[PDB]
Each structure stands twice: as C-alpha cells, then as structure tokens.
Amino acid sequence: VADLKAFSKHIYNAYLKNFNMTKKKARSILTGKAAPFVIHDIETLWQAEKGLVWPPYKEISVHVFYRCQCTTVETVRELTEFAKSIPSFSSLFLNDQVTLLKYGVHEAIFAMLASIVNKDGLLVANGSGFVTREFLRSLRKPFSDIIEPKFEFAVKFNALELDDSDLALFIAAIILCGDRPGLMNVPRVEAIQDTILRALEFHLQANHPDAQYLFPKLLQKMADLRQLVTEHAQMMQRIKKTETETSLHPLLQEIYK
Amino acid sequence: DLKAFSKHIYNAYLKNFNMTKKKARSILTGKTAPFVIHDIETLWQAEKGLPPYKEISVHVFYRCQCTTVETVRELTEFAKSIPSFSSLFLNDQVTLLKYGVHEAIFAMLASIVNKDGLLVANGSGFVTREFLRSLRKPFSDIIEPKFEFAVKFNALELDDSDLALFIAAIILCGDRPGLMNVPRVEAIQDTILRALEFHLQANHPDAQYLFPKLLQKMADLRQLVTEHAQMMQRIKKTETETSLHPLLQEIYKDMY
Ligand SMILES: CCCCOc1ccc(-c2c(C)ncc(C(=O)O)c2C)cc1CNC(=O)c1ccc(C(F)(F)F)cc1F
Ligand SMILES: CCCCOc1ccc(-c2c(C)ncc(C(=O)O)c2C)cc1CNC(=O)c1ccc(C(F)(F)F)cc1F
Ligand SMILES: CCCCCCCO[C@@H]1O[C@H](CO)[C@@H](O)[C@H](O)[C@H]1O
Ligand SMILES: CCCCCCCO[C@@H]1O[C@H](CO)[C@@H](O)[C@H](O)[C@H]1O
C-alpha cells in the first residue's frame, strides 16, 4: 500500500523534472492567468518564425510538418529522461528500453498533446504561441488528415479531467508495456506494467474519489491510443510514398521501419 | 579540454569495472591466492565454495555467457558515463554497444589473463587454459583464439589509463551498421583517438609506434568478433540442447 504511494510520488517527480509543459501550466495560459501569439494564417506564421523563440522551405504545409517533427523529436528527448528516471525502467537492458520507447513514445505524445489543447487550437513554442485548429484544418492533405484526429481524441480525453499527477502514472503505464513487438524480457515488463496500473487505480481512488469508473475508462483510452498510432503510422506510410518533397527526420525513420 | 576528457573517461573506467588490470596483476603475481580450476572436481568445488546441467563443456559455455551479460552491464554504464555518449538518442546508443561490446570484451579479457589461464569469480578463482582446451569442439574452438589475441595484446604493456581510452574508442565507433547520427559519432571517436594518442605519448614516452599499433589491434578485434559471431551462429544451429542468452541472441541476430 505504502509502496504504490511511494511509486506514484517518484514517477510524478520524474514527470515534473523532465517535461517542458504540464497540463497545469497550459490551463493557466489558455485561461489567461499565467499572452501567446495567435498563429492563424501565413501572415502570423511568418511573423512567429521571426519573432518567437523556437530545412529548405518547400511550401506552407510542409513547413508546418517540419515544426511537428521538431516537437516529436524534442518530446522523445523528454520521454527518454522520464522513463530513464524510473528505476524499474533503467533496470531493463538498454535495447529493451529502446523497444519500449520505439513503440511507446507516440501513444504518450498524443496523450500529452491533450494537455496543451482546447477545441480551437494548440500551444506551440514553450507556450508562447497558439496555433488555431482552423489554420491546421486549412493545410493541404495529407497533412490535414494527420493532425485532425489528434484534436478529436484530445477533446474526448480532456473530458476525463485528469491532472498531472494522473498523467505521470498514465504515461508511465504507456511506456512500460509488455505488448511491444520484440520485447526480450516480456514477463518482467508485464510485472512492471501491473505495478504502475495498480499504482494508477490507487491514486485515482485518492485524487478522484467521486469519479466512478475512471480507471476502466482510462484503460479504454490506452486502447484508443493504440488505434490512433496505428492509423497515424498508416498515414505516415502515405507521406513517405506520395510526398517526395518532404524529408523525414532520422529518428522518425527509425520508428516507422 | 582533452586532458579533462581523458581523466573523465579514466574515472568512469574505475567507477564501473570491478576488475582492473592493476588488481588482476596483483593476483597473478602474488602480492589471497586464487582457487585453480583445472578439472571437473575443482570446477564442482568452485560451484559450491566460490539452467539445466547438460554437460561440462556446455556448463562452462553457460558461465561464459554470464560473464558477457554482466560485462555488458558494466560497459553500458561506462558508456553512459561519457556525457557525449548519453546525448545520443537511445537507439544509437544500443547500436554502438550491440556491435561494440564484444570487441571491448575480448580486449578487456587480456587484463585478467596470463599465458596459462584467466581469473574468474571476482578474482577468487583461476581457470586454466588446458582445461578450456580440454573442452569439446566447438567450445574449444571458440575460447582458444581469444587467448592468442589476449597474449599478443599484453605485449603492448598497457595499463588502465590507456585501456579506458581504448575501450571508449571501441564503443564510440562511427562504422557501426544502422547508425542514425553518423557524423556526430565520427566526431566523438575522433576526439577519443586524439585524447588516446595524446595520452599515449605522455604515459608511454618511449613507446615507438604505439598508437598505430593500437589501431591495428582495433582492426584485429573487428576480425576476431566477426569470426566469433560465425562460431556462435553455428552453435545456435548445430547444438539444439545448448540455449543462448536472449541478450546474445539479439547481438548475433544480424552479424555476418
Ligand atoms: C491535439 C493536438 C493536435 C496537433 O498536434 C500534432 C498533431 C500531429 C503531429 C504529428 C505530425 C503532423 N506528423 C508526424 C508526427 C509524428 O511524430 O509521427 C506527429 C506527432 C504533431 C502535432 C504537434 N504540433 C506541433 O507541435 C506544432 C508546432 C508548431 C506549429 C506551427 F504551425 F506553429 F509551426 C504547428 C504545430 F502543429
Ligand atoms: C582470453 C580469455 C579467453 C577465455 O575467456 C572467454 C572466452 C570466450 C567467451 C565467450 C564464449 C565461450 N561464448 C560466447 C561469448 C559471447 O559473449 O559471445 C563469449 C565472450 C568467454 C570468456 C570468458 N570466460 C569466463 O568468464 C569463464 C567463467 C567461468 C568459467 C568456469 F569454468 F569456471 F565456470 C570459465 C570461463 F571461461
Ligand atoms: C544493452 C546492450 C545492448 C545490446 C543489445 C543488442 C541490440 O539488440 C537490438 O535491439 C533492437 C531493438 O531494440 C532490434 O531492432 C535489433 O534487431 C536488435 O539486434
Ligand atoms: C529515444 C527513443 C528511440 C526510439 C527510436 C526508434 C528505434 O529505432 C530502432 O532501433 C533499433 C536499434 O537501435 C533498430 O534495430 C531498429 O531497426 C530501429 O527501428
């Protein structure tokens, strides 16, 4: 009992230590209590690229696509240090850690993306900018069809009203997953995953005591997250096939191979 | 600062390797004597006072995989202690270790070996080379070539300060297949080799042609592991009864 309480406290500390944007910091900005420069067209995007403190320019949709890859690459840096900060994770052999991150970071990215989003847009560049969803909708396909489902997911996910102490356990349960293809020491990860999910439902009882059925709802979001990454990797197969102009970051080439 | 770079790696070496060449040379010269293992009985005694048992040759082969698995644990933390290495994305770290740990292992074996055998079990035992030769093929064909290299490598008379820079150059190799950030690695390797060459002329001022000799040993090690990888693959096909540690199954999966 007092082990899961200590486990939750340590994972939450890793979370706050390594991630650049909490859901608390983002709700502060999106409610005007922390103003981000609104990016809604080519005009404000060019000003942002000159004014905001953040490859050959091919076009507008491809430029935004490169900005998205930067976010992913940077978040993967943080997601590594978050998982490395978990002793059970660092105990695994280093190649099993890569297997977990390879199949794990994108599920965790789309969950954390809900933490910096309302139904009208998202926060970019350390919270100093707000890119409207309608401007993202107006990009040309496939780049439009890639971004839009992440909003539709982030809206339904934000209905559960999790805070950062909830997400730290939730994201940790995402990475420490025994279902990953090619895992060397499978039952070891399954044991770690069970400890975190137990720690999650225990923390959900204390922090969200009146919320009924919250834990089985979160498990469903973990299933919805596997589908979202499945469909995402399918659209990435299309970008590498039809978009000969767009280059792909080497870290994303390794993930989608 | 190259002077600080070499000193940091030498610190990570002492910080992560229980058995240094300095410690091992004390035990092999006489300044507690190791328990000599030369037959089945002394091996049996050592298992008490120092996987399903198939036979003796496979049992020793199982205890060799234990040393490799443990030495890979130490090498991982040694590489992680090099801050330039930790900045690499985790997948690139694995690639360097995957194709590098065994070149590093076969070089570090020479630190605990004389012409008559090697130290085992944290230095509390000495396994003879004739007892390793007495094992049946292919287990005898896998171990003896390591002795040949280990004795020729000991002729360079390196100490731990040299080996620390030598091991770091093996791990941080730009030629590893599947490397993501190739230029970054090639830069780090170039820094270590500069630090090694600079450290060699200061520590071995009279050693003629020492640095280009060590570069030949690095190529020699790449040949030894390639030959060692093939022998392991034939074992995985011929010997159904002998099981491989999953960490070695991942390493030898693609080595040709
Ligand atoms: C609920 C939120 C949905 C939107 O968020 C999404 C959705 C999908 C992706 C994505 C894409 C498109 N392609 C490949 C991958 C992959 O990693 O496989 C990923 C993860 C990225 C973001 C994150 N976006 C950004 O951070 C961002 C940054 C700057 C700008 C700016 F316009 F100002 F320049 C625009 C931006 F949108
Ligand atoms: C110059 C030194 C040469 C000998 O050292 C060698 C050579 C090859 C290997 C090896 C093998 C056989 N197979 C696969 C791999 C692989 O990793 O691919 C490796 C690296 C291991 C050792 C290290 N030996 C031991 O540590 C050891 C431990 C206990 C016992 C005991 F008998 F007491 F139980 C005997 C031992 F020899
Ligand atoms: C900790 C020591 C590091 C050595 C581990 C050996 C590396 O294994 C490799 O892990 C990769 C995914 O992680 C796989 O894609 C490769 O097929 C496999 O060869
Ligand atoms: C920091 C997160 C790292 C995640 C990057 C994704 C990992 O890439 C994979 O790395 C393996 C060896 O390194 C290769 O065998 C695989 O073919 C490759 O796809």
Curated annotation (Swiss-Prot), chain A:
The protein's assembly and partners: Heterodimer with the retinoid X receptor. Interacts (via domain NR LBD) with CRY1 and CRY2 in a ligand-dependent manner.
Recorded family membership: Belongs to the nuclear hormone receptor family. NR1 subfamily.
Organism: Homo sapiens
Annotated disulfide bonds: none
Membrane-spanning residues: none
Keywords assigned: Activator, DNA-binding, Metal-binding, Nucleus, Receptor, Transcription, Transcription regulation, Ubl conjugation, Zinc, Zinc-finger
GO biological process terms, semicolon-separated: adipose tissue development; apoptotic process; apoptotic signaling pathway; axon ensheathment; cell differentiation; cell population proliferation; cell-substrate adhesion; cellular response to hypoxia
Post-translational modification: 'Lys-48'-linked polyubiquitinated; leading to proteasomal degradation. Deubiquitinated and stabilized by OTUD3.
One Gene Ontology molecular-function label: sequence-specific double-stranded DNA binding
Full-sequence portion shown in this chain: 172 to 438 of 441
Protein name in UniProt: Peroxisome proliferator-activated receptor delta
Principal subcellular localisation of the protein: nucleus
Keyword set includes Ligase: no
